[PDB]
Design a protein around this ligand. Structure first.
Ligand code: NAD
Ligand code: NAD
Ligand code: NAD
Ligand code: NAD
Ligand code: OXQ
Ligand code: OXQ
Ligand code: OXQ
Ligand code: OXQ
Lengths: 322, 323, 323, 322
């Protein structure tokens, strides 16, 4: 075989892992390995997803595994391995930060597997607490700084954009709305940078297409979106938009698209941040994280951002203290 | 002042398959979506998740949830997945689509009243098991035209048949034409004789050593057991990815009048000598609904098998009337 | 008995752009296609070529040719490319869209009568140059609603603006929002101040050294001269690939009610203080046709430029009445 | 750049070359190099096609060239370089065989360029007389037998399928109709192998959905399709379906799809043919031509096939005698 297919390993074959494998089948993006510690269920997802290639009229290989040697040769690795909720807690008390002691353990295990079998892969961490887990994976795996990132802000921005799109009655394709920062209650939806095909939202508000109170409400909804879905589902958390967000990132790498997709990235001076990962606008291409966009935040915005930073910083301190 | 309105598909049942189909509509920007279910909460969680996905897919369709049939009014297509997947008490090995009869007949008749009242002009695709029995139940309970009601099953069965063959021949499933007809159950009939590689009979490939007769037979058996295998491996519910895509592919064939050949459970009126019943047959789906029902020249042997398939639907239909 | 009919797009003019748009309809299975032209023979050659392509694309739409307006009846959308691309006698360097006025005004008025008679309910997209002048000419000659007629131009101009910026910043054009408004000609206005990278002002990228002001200006000039450069390089006719995609993108926004922001020549009724004329402005295209006309808070400087753009269309419209 | 984009070189940037570059832009299939001996026009096509990426929201590089070093690193090379008609002749007398003395020269030039700058590419010859030209390119370039093929039968089959699809009122996706043999008047539309999703056409005829006379007519139309389009266009020949046919082949290689796409391939015993290229059913994947399907032709079919073979054989004799 002179021209081999792209290969993506889904470390974690739950709701998101399986849905991402499905997206690969639909777009014929790459061969898929549905890895997981659970036996049985992954083979079931693998069979379901592979059988879908017939109807999709595409041809990629979807298999399951529980041995890390199976992910060797992966171009991309998307990690969803972990718990979605704390055993016992109610949905009313769902908190991403509480998954720390449970998932760090899992992420470290995965890091060792990747370091050993596919150290040249581009890694996309999904597992929560996202920003903390990406840093955890980076340290444990030893992979280059530009080849590791966490999917979060693309999802947050998707919500931000959809809400605005509904109000303005314009397609979300033409709404540029970005959320940066830690993926949690202190994420920062950049209201001042929201544009309609480049045109500042401020101009649409001055014309009565949206009220300042509605924008504020949309900014709040964006932050609460994840918990809202957790509350409404009853079982687990969001997986459709999250799966597409991660795959969109994977494709940007695979096809060297150079798409601007906000994701938790390694900081070396940007925004005055050092030795940590946090959500920021970035460009993803064949070189991994090729650009970290440094925006000129206002003082008011810097305060909000600093609080968002405190969250990861304390989260990372708790991680170390274990 | 909208002159050009988007297509609308109501998903009656917002479980694993319903939500996945809504996701598909988002990705292809196929149609606005209504995720209907008797359960409140979950559907809206699905609607939010799927609608938020439009942003990343850069498409624009509306995805909302509902628990009131008035919401499905105007739907161009209705795909029904409402129903149980497994019978409480039964082991995974004991899983049988037929045991679902007394639980889902009730549900399908309710849905029938809802469609009859709010969107009687829709093209209806039943998915709920026992499929062939449920489609017939929906059709008589709803009163919709015979060419506007069908059941999704054989597209899924054929997909498996095709994927298995494709793997063995090292050829894309796009170029494997393998068809399964009959009742969606243990007596479904994978038409081994009609398997082709871009029109070239499989037997020529076998004669040339590409694969053996024994493997063909192994694959035929595997096709029949595919559902239960996944039920066993998942440990919860049943398949939904391929099922959702099968149904949406049929829905799209209708919406865009593609005239695709997609085997599904259809109303019989003389084909293969059958009357007043639904069963899997190769059909052509287009803007006119089920536009053609292909009647294949089956051999006596295949007829023997097909009759066992019919016996099953006939029995189920009897068990239904016996309620 | 077809309940769900495919969309229908009539291509008035089956030259380079018309045929390419039909090709696009085939690939996306967007709609049935009618390749209309006064010339006989060539259009049918295009129809055969494009229809045969459906097989390889595995899609199913109808592509036919015509020379009689009765054939475009029922069209949901009409894209007009009928007209000359260059003036015989003129050198390539002398190429100017304005010189096409006396040759295409005649053609556009004929097409107007055809649409008025056979498919007056269509969403019409004019492409023929001089664009802004031709769209206005079509609108008054046809009598169609003001929200159902527009001209494709600025989407193409913006595409160039975006591609140039994208190359310099090493970012996909998907994430570059660069817009051009005004008359489709040497006085078009690439809005440098409104150029963003996913909403982030370009000036921040310039301030950080990613690219210089001089390059921005070089690109602004390049955007204006793009058409003539291609005319010069091709040596025959003018651009058609990006043009065809620009028009089909607008057509799709209408057909599937996507509500996309696509700058195009639209009917003015007070925006920027303009009345009874068409000119390029950012607009929102959906199922209601031109659903929104965005009026940007232009600075005096940008207003000065925009006024020169308006002066051009006003002059052309005068030259037209003077016929 | 860890993950580089696929690269396709269009040797010949005329109607087909440009249209293929356009398809790459639409599908984001690969970066495109529009090569040609003509200067000016290719840069115009390159600009037009690249500008289309913005509207398509894709990101690939489309450039032009007239120096072979520019095609270095190409994964695929599609050759359309050549004349479409004999200078002076009327459209009434159009014949693919007459382009021989004009295009062999051109194909040999291209062979030297490919051999030198991208010998590891998968080559798809389009230039006519197709079957003769593929053999000409193979001999001159020295590329492996499985990495060189000629696009023709996919186009012929597309016509065959479309005509049948219209009559049966079924999508061409579900019509399997194949044409094999030399791309010319003696091409062989395999009427006995036409199926509707695997179901023999014979069964649809017995049911009155199509008449035997209509099938015969469709078989004739298929052979005459190319000349018909030449007659109707006035300028050149077909390019839309031809461009999609070649790109579909290129994609099958690039993404290792293993699609059954009839194309002129190297024969080593198949159908009793030796040292020549001719249209036959084949599977295209990452290994190039991975399979040559040998069908059990009836005696009647073998006669027709042998005449089709005679055509290339004599064509190849004329090539040698130059
Ligand atoms: N960043 C974001 O925006 C975002 C969005 C949604 C969910 N998430 C997070 O994604 C994660 C997965 O969500 P989900 O819905 O797919 O959950 P899920 O429970 O459906 O799947 C998680 C899977 O991880 C597997 N797993 C556990 N330990 C493992 C190990 N050591 N190795 C391999 N696999 C292991 C489990 O068996 C399970 O199948 C959660 O931690 C969730 O909080 C993040
Ligand atoms: N034909 C086929 O090939 C095929 C393939 C897979 C599954 N199925 C069948 O499809 C059905 C759905 O499968 P699933 O995986 O989505 O199951 P699921 O359990 O995930 O979802 C079924 C949904 O139906 C809803 N429901 C129940 N009663 C209802 C009512 N009266 N009105 C509206 N909604 C109601 C439930 O609340 C639930 O959300 C099952 O019966 C299954 O056996 C058929
Ligand atoms: N708005 C833009 O941005 C833009 C971009 C490119 C080209 N254009 C303009 O688009 C037009 C078409 O460009 P093209 O490349 O397709 O040109 P073309 O010469 O290839 O095709 C124009 C076609 O119009 C046909 N035609 C002439 N009179 C007609 C009539 N009365 N009825 C029906 N058809 C008639 C011709 O026979 C010819 O086939 C030109 O006027 C060109 O200047 C505009
Ligand atoms: N196999 C098939 O099914 C099929 C179908 C259609 C056309 N064709 C053949 O494809 C070829 C191209 O068709 P087209 O419509 O694109 O023609 P075209 O005239 O539009 O383009 C051919 C291009 O080849 C270029 N060229 C000439 N000599 C060259 C050289 N030495 N190096 C590089 N480029 C050179 C020309 O400058 C011209 O731009 C013709 O020979 C035609 O007969 C084959
Ligand atoms: O943000 C979400 O929707 C989410 N769901 O599970 N984890 C998350 O971060
Ligand atoms: O066929 C299947 O996979 C299936 N799963 O649930 N019902 C079915 O028919
Ligand atoms: O802008 C162009 O490229 C163009 N080509 O022909 N007319 C035009 O406006
Ligand atoms: O077959 C065709 O259409 C053709 N057109 O130009 N050369 C050919 O072979």
């Amino acid at each position: 075989t002179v021209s081999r297919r792209k290969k993506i390993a889904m470390i974690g074959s739950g709701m998101i892992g399986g849905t991402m494998g499905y997206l690969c089948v639909l777009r014929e993006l790459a061969d898929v390995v549905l890895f997981d510690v659970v036996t049985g269920m992954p083979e079931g997802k693998a069979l379901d997803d592979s059988q879908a290639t017939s109807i999709a009229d595409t041809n990629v290989s979807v298999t399951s595994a529980n041995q890390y040697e199976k992910i060797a040769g992966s171009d991309v690795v998307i990690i969803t391995a972990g718990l979605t909720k704390v055993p016992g807690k109610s949905d009313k008390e769902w908190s991403r930060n509480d998954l720390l002691p449970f998932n760090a353990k899992i992420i470290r295990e995965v890091a060792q597997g990747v370091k050993k079998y596919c150290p040249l892969a581009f890694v996309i961490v999904v597992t929560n607490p996202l920003d903390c887990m990406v840093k955890c994976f980076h340290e444990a795996s030893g992979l280059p700084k530009n080849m590791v990132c966490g999917m979060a802000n693309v999802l947050d921005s998707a919500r931000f954009r959809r809400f605005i799109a509904d109000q303005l009655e314009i397609s979300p394709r033409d709404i540029q709305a970005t959320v940066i920062g830690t993926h949690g209650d202190h994420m920062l939806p950049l209201a001042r940078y929201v544009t309609v095909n480049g045109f500042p939202l401020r101009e649409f508000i001055k014309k009565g297409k949206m009220t300042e109170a509605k924008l504020a409400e949309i900014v709040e909804r964006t932050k609460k979106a994840g918990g809202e879905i957790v509350r409404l589902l009853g079982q687990g958390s969001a997986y459709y938009a999250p799966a597409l967000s991660a795959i969109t990132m994977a494709q940007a790498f695979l096809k060297d698209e150079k798409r601007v997709l906000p994701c938790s990235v390694y900081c070396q001076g940007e925004y005055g941040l050092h030795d940590m990962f946090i959500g920021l606008p970035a460009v993803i291409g064949g070189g991994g994280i090729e650009q970290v966009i440094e925006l000129e935040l206002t003082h008011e915005e810097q305060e909000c951002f600093r609080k968002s930073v405190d969250d990861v910083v304390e989260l990372n301190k708790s991680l170390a203290a274990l």
